[PDB]
Structure formats: structure tokens, C-alpha cells
Design brief:
This is Histidine kinase CKI1. It is found in: Cell membrane. By secondary structure, the chain is α/β, with parallel strands linked by helices. It has five helices and six strands; from the N terminus they run E-E-H-E-H-E-H-E-H-E-H. It has one domain: Response regulator (Rossmann fold, 3-Layer(aba) Sandwich). Helix 2 packs parallel to helix 3 and helix 3 runs parallel beside helix 4.
Amino acid sequence: SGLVPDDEFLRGKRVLVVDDNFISRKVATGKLKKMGVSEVEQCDSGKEALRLVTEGLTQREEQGSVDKLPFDYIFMDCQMPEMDGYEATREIRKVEKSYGVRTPIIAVSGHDPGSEEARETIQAGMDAFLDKSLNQLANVIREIE
């Protein structure tokens, strides 16, 4: 848990889980479903996350949807092969600019960041940082809110 410079807790909310590990991804989605999440989507890579966000934001804009964000929250694994969660987040932020919106993106990491990771967390534009156990998931979302 921290900000970056229960069965109805998340009812009404749609979430994307980005995790390159099939087992922890399923653990994350199960936890979210149990907290009442109305829709959980999951993907296994930064490039897939970017695609889902890019397409969702266009689709909502073209439809004039009430909610313009396709996901109310995104739980992004920091370390993944190919496009890691820093780079995916930076690209998401660039895509969001022409919509005037900002998705809450929570960096999910198995260890405290060092200096270089901490810097990348801020520069990519993540909103919070959360341990891989997800035990502080609810406290972090209320901090964001």
C-alpha cells in the first residue's frame, strides 16, 4: 500500500487485472468478484492492457457513453515481459489525453520499489502501489477515492 505522488464494496465498479502470471491473475479476479465487482476483465500483458483501454475509450466516446472510462480501476503488474506495467501505464496516459479522462492505475508489485522503480512509478503516472497479496486493496481504493 500507498498513493503515488465487503461483498458490495466494489459493486457498480468495472476493473481490469493485468498480470502475466496465470495463477496470481485468477487469484486477483476472484478477490475482486467477491468484493462485488460488477465486471472484471483480465489480460496477461501490458500490450493487451493498452489495446483494451484504447479500444474501450474509443468505443465509449463514439457511443457518447455516460461512463467514458472503460475501467474504473486497473491493477497493473509492474514487472512483466515485453511491455512492463510502467511502460503500459505511460502509454495509457498518452492515449487518455485526447479524451480528457484519467483511469486510476494501481501498480502491483511483489517487492518494495527501489529508487529507479519508484521514479518510474511517478513518471509513468501510476496513482498507487499495492503489494501482490492485495491485502491493502480496499484501503488503497478508498485513499484514491
